[PDB]
Structures are given as C-alpha cells and as structure tokens.
C-alpha cells in the first residue's frame, strides 16, 4: 500500500518437534540474532512455539526487557513431540485478528521454521491456516532448517520466493524485514 503502516509486527512461529532436537541450538541463534538487531519501538514481536500444543511463549509485545525475558525462556525449551504447524499459525491468527480491531493498519509478518515436514493429515491444515493468516493480512516467510522440501513450504509461505534456508536466512531477512521498516510510518 502507498499509505504507510501504522504498526509493524513480527511472529517467530518456531518448531520444537522431535526432529529439531539436534537443531534447537541453531534455531535459537537465529531468533536472538533477529530480535537483537531490530530494536525499534515501532516493531513488536511475539514468540510462538509448536510441537503438539501451539503455545504463545510471549505475546505481541515490544518491551525489550520482556523480549529479553522471552529470549531467556527460548534457550531453555526442550524439543520433542509431533509437528502441529497449523497450531503454530492459529496462535498468530488469534493475534492478527485481535490487532486488526484497533483502527491501526498494521503489518503482520510470520516466520516459520521446520525440519521434520508434515504428514498429509497435518499439511492439509497448515496450508489451510496459512491461507487463513494471509486472509487476515499477513506475510508468511518460511525459513528452512536442514533438509526440507521447498514444495512442502511453497504452499505454506507466500511462494517459492519466500522460502529460505536457515544459513541464508539471516542473510535474506536482514533487509527483507528491513524493507517494510522504511515503508512504514
């Protein structure tokens, strides 16, 4: 939009499945490096985890003491369980719809992480919820930790242009997240 966004948000929808048990020390490094880079008070961020229960580990806040208290909690999260990536998206969909009712034309950004890709009965709902969150007005990015089908994340993200490996992920999302900060008010 040519009108600048009154708010700007960020959602770290993070996998804590059994598949990321040997990779949580790399996922946690990716989240802290994006939180301690964007220190602007215009940007709020929320930490959503999912293995079996999609659980909001930190609400949509901006207080850098709370986010530091949020990041001290993500370091001590034990991976394990299934991969319910649709319930990672439902906690963000309860926050986009809650923040579309403020009169502020904000901008929701969603970052997803997955090693163990989803079964057919679970990929059907995570593709459905990612269609639901885009209808709520979000921009879904799908950051990929180690080996993953791009096609299984092509439906989840906006396109194949929005799927990134995790080593290139901070190299990608350095200016991709920053592109809308200058676009904002």
């Amino acid at each position: 939009s040519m009108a600048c966004y009154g708010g700007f948000d960020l959602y770290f929808i993070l996998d804590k499945s059994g598949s990321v048990l040997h990779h949580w020390n790399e996922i946690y490094y990716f989240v802290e490096q994006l939180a301690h880079k964007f220190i602007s008070p215009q940007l709020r961020m929320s930490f959503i985890v999912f293995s079996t229960r999609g659980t909001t580990l930190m609400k949509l806040t901006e207080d850098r003491e709370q986010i530091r208290q949020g990041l001290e909690e993500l370091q001590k999260v034990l991976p394990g369980g299934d991969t319910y990536m649709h319930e990672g998206f439902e906690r963000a969909s309860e926050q986009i719809y809650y923040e579309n009712r403020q009169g502020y034309r904000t901008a929701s950004v969603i970052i997803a992480l997955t090693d163990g890709e989803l079964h057919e009965d679970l990929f059907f709902y995570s593709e459905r919820e990612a269609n639901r969150s885009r209808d709520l007005g979000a921009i879904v990015y799908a950051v990929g930790v180690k080996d993953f089908n791009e096609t299984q994340l092509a439906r989840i993200a906006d396109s194949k242009d929005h799927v990134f490996p995790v080593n290139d992920g901070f190299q990608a999302l350095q200016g991709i997240i920053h592109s809308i900060l200058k676009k904002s008010c």
């Binding site: 048990l21 394990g80 369980g81 009965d121 679970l122």
Partner: protein, 267 residues
Amino acid sequence: DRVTTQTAGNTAINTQSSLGVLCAYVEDPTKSDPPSSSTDQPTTTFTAIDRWYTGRLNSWTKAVKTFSFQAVPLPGAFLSRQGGLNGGAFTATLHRHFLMKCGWQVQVQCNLTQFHQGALLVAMVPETTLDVKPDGKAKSLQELNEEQWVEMSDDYRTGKNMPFQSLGTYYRPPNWTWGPNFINPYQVTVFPHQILNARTSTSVDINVPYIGETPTQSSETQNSWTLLVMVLVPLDYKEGATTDPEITFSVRPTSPYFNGLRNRYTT
C-alpha cells in the same frame, strides 16, 4: 559357586560372575504346551535352533546420561539383524512359519573392571514399541548407529511418541498427550530384571516364558518381549582405564512352536 556354564545345543557360554538365572513368573519357563489355536502339527524345537545367538550392542561411554535405554526386540532382532545378530537356522524357520510361540532366555555381558562404576538395568520388558520411531516406521540399522543410545526424554515417559494412525483431512488432528506404551523409567524393575553393576557381576541372566494376547502370535509382527538395557548410574573412570566397554547379548529361544508353514516371507 558363581561359575555356571549354560550348554545348549552346539553353543555353550561361560560366566564367572553369575548372579543366577532370573526365571520369570514360573519355576521352569521351558515347559510349554502346544498352541490351542492351530489344527495342524507344530514344528517343535530341534537341535539346530536350540542354541545361543550372540550379537553385539552399542558401546557404553561417559557421554550416556541416566535412563538412556537401548531396546532389542525379540524376535524382532533376529529378523532385521540388529547388532550383527544373525538368527541362523532360527530365522530361516521364522520366515517360513506364520505363527510362532516361544519363550526367551537372554544374557547380557558387559565386563567392567573393578575401577569403573556404573549400573546397567537389563530387563525383559513385555509389549513395548521402543524400537519404533515416533513416526511409525521401525528403526533401521543406520538409525541405531546415528544415536547409539536412546535418551529418556519426556516423549518416552509420557508415551507421547508411540505410533498412531493418520486420521485424515476430515478430523481436526487432536493434541496427542499420552499413550499406553510409555516407559516409566523409575518402574522398570517390576519387569524380570537384573542389575549389571560394575562391582558384582559381568553377566545378567533372565529366563522368560511365552506371554502374549493370543495362544500363539504372528511371526513377523510380534514384539511380546523387548530386551531393554537402561543406564541407572553413568559410567565413570579415571583417565587411563579401558574406555567404552562393549555390551553384548545372547538370546536363546526356549521351546518354540512354529505353526502354519508357508514359503519364505515376501513383503
């Protein structure tokens, strides 16, 4: 005294630190009548399967934590050759019979010097799906090498990761939180067990009978017992002692009954 040689067929095994043969649930678990769910004559024991089958098992390092188990299914290790455990003429008969009804007799060897400490918990744990990934498929020989020891996480304590069926796109997939093939790691000593302490013995001796929901079970798809070597106390030594002691096991089926002969099992 503590020197018991257990001769069986053409394969005998010695031990000089024998605690005793922990016979399970009965006085003699070798005595076993034929199955009552067959109207043919069973293939009983014969002198080419009445013998021990030594196969290796992964080493026990200092890196292993407490309660990290390592499951060896029976007869499921004869069929996938788990730990170099070729079944010989037992697996050559197990593939050709549809139902099989035997009771096991295992023995786990691990030689610790008197300057090591540690305590494996060897137990014949009935009816568990511990060899199966939380995603259905059974573990191959590579995945038993890629982890070497399965950590007792919360998914094993709650039974959250036992295999399930895909409910499909119709049902909303429920948040699975519990399943009855859990391990309570503190209560594995209810099973027929001995503790392989680093200061009393080097060989535990468990002798279990046939148990199962039917009077004889299928040959390819049974897991009615599961050898389960669990670390209660981690290994510790000073620098210079023999690092990474090996663990072996020795499985002998007592009184099998093979029913339902057919050709060799093609999937």
